[PDB]
Symmetry: C3
Subunit: 298 residues, 3 copies
Amino acid sequence: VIRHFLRDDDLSPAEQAEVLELAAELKKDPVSRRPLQGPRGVAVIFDKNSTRTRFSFELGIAQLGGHAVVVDSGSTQLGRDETLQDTAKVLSRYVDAIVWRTFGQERLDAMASVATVPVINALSDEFHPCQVLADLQTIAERKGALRGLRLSYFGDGANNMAHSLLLGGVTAGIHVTVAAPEGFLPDPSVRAAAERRAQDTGASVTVTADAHAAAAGADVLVTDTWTSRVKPFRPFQLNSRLLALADSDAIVLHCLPAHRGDEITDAVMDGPASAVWDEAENRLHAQKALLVWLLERS
Amino acid sequence: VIRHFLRDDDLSPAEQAEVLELAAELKKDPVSRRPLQGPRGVAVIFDKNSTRTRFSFELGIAQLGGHAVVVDSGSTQLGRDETLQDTAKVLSRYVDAIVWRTFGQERLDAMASVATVPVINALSDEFHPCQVLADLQTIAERKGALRGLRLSYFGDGANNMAHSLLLGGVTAGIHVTVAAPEGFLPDPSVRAAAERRAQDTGASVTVTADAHAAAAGADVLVTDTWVKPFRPFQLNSRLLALADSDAIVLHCLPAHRGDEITDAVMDGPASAVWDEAENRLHAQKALLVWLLERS
Amino acid sequence: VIRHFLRDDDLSPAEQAEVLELAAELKKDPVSRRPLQGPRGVAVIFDKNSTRTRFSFELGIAQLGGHAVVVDSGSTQLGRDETLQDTAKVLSRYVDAIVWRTFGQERLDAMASVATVPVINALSDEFHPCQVLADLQTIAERKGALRGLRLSYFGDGANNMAHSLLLGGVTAGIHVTVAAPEGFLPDPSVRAAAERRAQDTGASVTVTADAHAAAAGADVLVTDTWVKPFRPFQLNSRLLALADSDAIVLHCLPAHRGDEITDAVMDGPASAVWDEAENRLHAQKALLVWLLERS
């Protein structure tokens, strides 16, 4: 009974492999799977609006045969006028899955503890597991492989992207380096779980403040905006020079939106190493795959 | 020429049975009717926002083959920039029905005086007839025949729910009782029309401040979110004990647990609240079908 | 390769003829053409909300088999957070076209410059070309051939409807007149481009401050919302009578009855205002279809 996806480690490696395999299949034949045919409903809920998250979910649902019901931040926020449990119980009568952008993980857990349909974290304060799914797919297609690559993330190590890349990466078997200054380290319990999960996949977790050392011989370079007070992040800028220390075949990822000239330069964003646009496109195929997998299991 | 749904008594007892029988058919086979295949448009319009009305309507529309165009209260309110008549006449060209959540009844009548397609009260200040259709549907799946049951409503006796349970209940032949505190009674015209409808069906209308007497021998106990005068009207286990042993509890939602209802009642075995939310879809679906095929 | 629609003259006269003719076929058979079957996505984005635009576009898209993702003025404005070029490249990966209600023309040009799918001007500060297609469509069904007809616009000569009726009107072969007061002239370069386009189609452009004269003999009388020196330009029974006996009136909506146009004109027998509003749906499908097969 009933699977959810609130954080990257909610999947096991084999299960993450299956989902990513299915993402490959769906990119090629986007309307070949129709488990939401009817149309069946899926809730798409935003505590804070995210436009790229709405596009990719809303079209991806429609393409699986369903109808996304989308609700804004312009509505009464979910836990204010009734408990989240009540909202979950009611929504479970209307839709086959619940996709939710929100704040703390405790709110996701609350909803997921009583729902009779899958709950999916669209993007939270702590995690961004749908983005990492698309990151991994973009890596799979660009490099032909996943296990054993060396991935480096630069910038705020406490942000949602840094956590997810840690958890999602080691699940995929990727050696993850987080390159972050001073006091912008990963939340410790996230780091412990990523190390624990790494012991089953042959991966590892490295945290350092040395942006040169983290860039050296890396296969993938990743960065995010400096908060989604900026003096400490400048050595961590993805520029031509830093990318020149990476493997010669290395690729660059950015979940977007980018602030060109701060965390990433125009040469690197617009250059041959950048997978940024395919990555963006891949939000659509990954989340599609996620849903199918979840629905056939629930 | 054109049937609308603005209040529970726009349908006749005979016709309300048709909609209800159809709603049970639709619960069993949710995609078997496709009158909106095309897709044809339906307008879904919110002067004040309602999440659960959005879910149920929008989905039910899609499952009839059509497509709902949803506008929020994050857009210019309907009667300000142009007359309600003008908007009605334009919408009429784009959609086959108009589903509107709005305030005063006069706004609904203004829109429905000139529309060439059915107009539906999604929810308003004065009635909530789609909720009562869902209420009657779930009552019917638990206790069979509707004619003759005793239904009591507790809480603010002047809000849209009481008006509608009054209007809807007697339509279906149920004996409706509003239990309200001293300064909170139904609109007297709604009250009188309910008494006028009840004569056709064998029903009756009671208004009282006696929670204990209203709860006694009751078949169905209902409440809505409400305040010191309201507390003796609370749906609690001690109030439930006075009811019939087979009694059920409905609540239109959201609940404010610890006020109008209690955790033990709403999560207890007499609670029908979840089936009650679900049937918003089925009832509204069947309403669309019924109206479209008669327009 | 890749055709956009940001101003009316983005289409050549022959290209325009095609779209309009298609509009009539799609009016007669709304679900006959299905290029976005899948559904494929189209972006519908509003820097500024517009209810009637949402309706026509969203259902248009649904009836070609696609799915409209609609984003409101209630999200971050489209350029404040990432550059437009980046937005365009990303949307080009999700949708097959971008429909956009924005402000300055340079914002549309920016998006159009790097997107790999058609970009459409749903409404902007300078132009409203989608409305004029609907206007042209409605004039065609009333009077037959468009060539050589006289159309006069009344009110603010500098607004988006004024520009678009000039460029769109002369593109169809229509003698366009703007009746505007004082210092409410058309943009000089828009007027220039209208004059060139008119030499091509063998039509003409007139701009005057004499309403009486502009009304005289005209086939089509048009107006938009406005406030003091516009009062001699009102569409009243008087001004209508000075036109041709078989004239028609258009108004893009919403109308402030009593100001730019009176009750008796608007609810009269020369008023094509509701057909004009219906045809927003049909003309924008035709544009979608046309632009898509060329991209």
